[PDB]
């Protein structure tokens, strides 16, 4: 199974910041990879375009993907409201890791997070399914607008998104 | 200037710490589940005819970070220890919070109120009698609340202020 590549064009208060691209590990977590791929293209008629990074905690991660409620509580998968933890083969090994947010076991939806450091205490709890390919400096720049509790000081949006490969 | 009180709301995930705090501060019920990282609120109130400024720390109920609680337990002046009446695990967790506060503050004598939340729900798994005894064992009040209906909310927080006032 070939790993696809998706991109986000990130905006700050409606101004372009830059592009982040992700390799999705379809070769290890195809179900989880395919959810994120399809939400990135919008091909199911919903997805990440126009949604925000609601939680940015410098030295840890950037969290987004609530495109249903836009308040950090919502989101949904292409398989329904929630899907099972596919596996925990991949670990939170350092900056750029892309992983599923959840509300405990088997509650994967659309919310995800991008690690800006190793978060090894999330190993076996959150499904890792990809990694930043290009634009790790844009993820670093997003930390400009975060805080200790994650509230953002500017609105950080996925102004556009899609598949590259 | 009016006296300030540093209140800290603690307890297991989902017991309604945030729903209680937001009922008090903003007078609405949060029906959605937005698990907390950490939030602070300020509100001036009059209790027993004395104006005071409540600084309220709404903490995370994530068991993974039980070690991260020490720093806010050192700075807090009074604690709302919250369980949900339909979550016997959250009631078991009260002991652990109480023992952690006592250990971190190195004192038997910390202002604290036991809060039994979600009393609007039709079914309870925790015996009001058990919560009464546990509070008696600790020497602290026990207040039943519903963040949904606002039942007991002001009573829970104001009772904690009175506990701090008596300690001072
Ligand atoms: C104790 C303080 N504190 C910390 C933390 C911890 C640490 N450490 C821990 C590890 N130690 C090392 C071993 C030595 C060092 C010190 C330091 N400083 C902090 C912060 C900055 O101090 C305020 C955290 C943290 C996390 C939570 C609550 C409190 C937390 C929390 C609440 S909800 C959740 N976590 C999971 C959440 N779920 C949802 O959002 C559900 C919403 C509803 O349904 C869909 C949607 C989710 O999936 N993610 C995606 C994954 C990252 C995760 N959020 C998140 O935000 O983690 C934040 C953070 C900073 C990584 C961890
Ligand atoms: N019926 C009912 N539901 C309540 C009550 N208080 C809170 N809830 C519900 O319980 C869920 C969790 O409430 P919340 O305040 O977020 O709990 P918490 O203790 O702050 N959670 P956390 O530790 O993750 O931050 C929400 O869906 C909320 O609406 C209550 O008194 N009655
Ligand atoms: Mg909360």
Residue numbers in the entry:
A (entry chain D): 1 to 165
B (entry chain A): 0 to 167
Paper text:
RAS family genes encode small GTPase proteins that regulate cell proliferation in response to growth factor stimuli. Here we describe RMC-7977, a reversible, tri-complex RAS inhibitor with broad-spectrum activity for the active state of both mutant and wild-type KRAS, NRAS and HRAS variants (a RAS(ON) multi-selective inhibitor). The binary CYPA–compound complex then binds to active RAS (with dissociation constant Kd2) to form a tri-complex structure in which CYPA sterically occludes RAS–effector interactions. Although neither RMC-7977 nor CYPA alone exhibited any measurable binding to GMPPNP–KRAS, RMC-7977 makes multiple π–π and hydrophobic contacts with RAS in the switch I (SWI) and SWII region once the tri-complex is formed.
All residues in the binding site are identical among HRAS, KRAS and NRAS, and RMC-7977 is equipotent across these RAS isoforms. Kd2 measurements for all three wild-type RAS proteins were approximately 100 nM (KRAS Kd2 = 116 nM, NRAS Kd2 =  101 nM and HRAS Kd2 = 94.7 nM). RMC-7977 exhibited similar activity for wild-type and mutant RAS variants in biochemical assays, and in the live-cell nano-BRET assay the cellular potency for inhibition of CRAF (RBD) binding to wild-type KRAS was only modestly lower than that for the oncogenic variants.
